[PDB]
Amino acid sequence: SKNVVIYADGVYDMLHLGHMKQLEQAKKLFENTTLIVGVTSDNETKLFKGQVVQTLEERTETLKHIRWVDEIISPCPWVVTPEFLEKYKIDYVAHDDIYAWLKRAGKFKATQRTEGVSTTDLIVRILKNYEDY
Amino acid sequence: SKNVVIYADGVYDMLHLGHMKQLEQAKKLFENTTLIVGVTSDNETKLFKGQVVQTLEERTETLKHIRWVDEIISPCPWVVTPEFLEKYKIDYVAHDDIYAWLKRAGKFKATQRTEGVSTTDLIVRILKNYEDY
Ligand SMILES: NCc1ccnc(N)c1
Ligand SMILES: NCc1ccnc(N)c1
């Protein structure tokens, strides 16, 4: 089968199993893929989305260790454009509307989030060893 | 170059960049390796070492996403023995003494820990957004 270029993007702050499963899902959308992962900038993430603990460099360095990741664009653009897909020869965007154009182009592929497995969920579990009273 | 079987073991609780760098180091000890990673049991870790947030199954599932990991033994034995090295055809043990026999056998390879990159370090950074006064 021909190689298919998949693009996923995100913050990837305090990388956890939920991120890695979503990256696995994107990587496995077809038999033979290149998974490019875009990591959002510190300034744009904080302005448009919310707070981020780790710097772009830290978030990117951690992602390089994930086996599903073939290429990283860091920083990535905050908004995906058709020209961006042309520049990097991206066939499909893997995502969990602003995205109507992607669906009309046949380039939108859904991925799922996993609940209850985040890094902050783990800290909440640590805290339960300390009773309120 | 002939394939070399490397064994590393650990708790791998709330997997972070420091773990992944140490696994990368073990994987890259020689040109061609198989990196087997042993994950310690919940009961033995808590008895002999200290507290663990994630279950063996969770710690193991997260490790499978790391690109350096070729095989996982989960649970692994708490203490490595010469018979264990024979059973899994392990050439070297990558570790950061109880381990004198490994050094005498020529099978001890040192790896390093990275400071300041742990999951709990990140939570400490979150807390600094809240002044004492
Ligand atoms: N590894 C690429 C990258 C991303 C962000 N900041 C850097 N200094 C480098
Ligand atoms: N994936 C192996 C494994 C380790 C611990 N517990 C399980 N149920 C399974």
In order, the DSSP letters of B94-110 are EE--TTHHHHHTT-EEE
A7 annotated to a ligand binding site: no
- A16, A35, A65, A66, best to mutate vs chain B, most B CBs in 10 Å: A65
The residue among A66, A78, A15 whose CA lies nearest residue A41 is A78
* Measured distance CA(B72)–CA(B64) in Å, rounded: 8
Query: Is A128 in contact with A106 (CB distance < 8 Å)?
Result: no
| Range(s) of the domain holding residue B122 | 1-133
Joined tokens for residue B98: 């109880």
* Measured distance CA(B32)–CA(A86) in Å, rounded: 37
Query: Is A80 in contact with A95 (CB distance < 8 Å)?
Result: no
For this PDB entry, the determination method is X-ray
* DSSP code at position B51: -
* Measured distance CA(B107)–CA(B101) in Å, rounded: 9
What is the DSSP annotation of A91-116?
A: -EEEE--TTHHHHHTT-EEE--PPSS
* DSSP code at position B77: P
* Measured distance CA(B64)–CA(B52) in Å, rounded: 19
B67 and A65: CB-CB below 8 Å? yes
Query: Residues 6 or more apart from B101 whose CB is under 8 A from it?
Result: B82
Query: Is B110 in contact with B9 (CB distance < 8 Å)?
Result: no
Query: Is B88 in contact with B5 (CB distance < 8 Å)?
Result: yes
Question: Which residue's CA is minimally distant from atom 9 of ligand 1?
Answer: A57
The structure tokens 């260790």 sit at: A65
Ligand 1 atom closest to the CA of A74, numbered from 1:
4
Secondary element (H or E) of residue A9 = strand A4-10
The structure tokens 């805290």 sit at: A127
Strands B92-95 and B71-76: unpaired
Total number of domains constituting chain A: 1
Regarding the beta carbon of A71 and ligand 1, being less than 6 Å apart is answered: no
* Measured distance CA(B25)–CA(B33) in Å, rounded: 11
**Residues lining ligand 2, Cβ inside 6 A:** B 56-57, 60, 74
Other beta carbons less than 10 A from residue B75's beta carbon: 16
Q: Which residues of A touch B124 (CB under 8 A)?
A: none
Amino acid at B96: D
Resolution at which this structure was determined, Å: 1.8
Please provide the distance, in angstroms rounded to a whole number, between the alpha carbons at the two ends of chain A: 61
Q: Compute the residue count for chain A.
A: 133
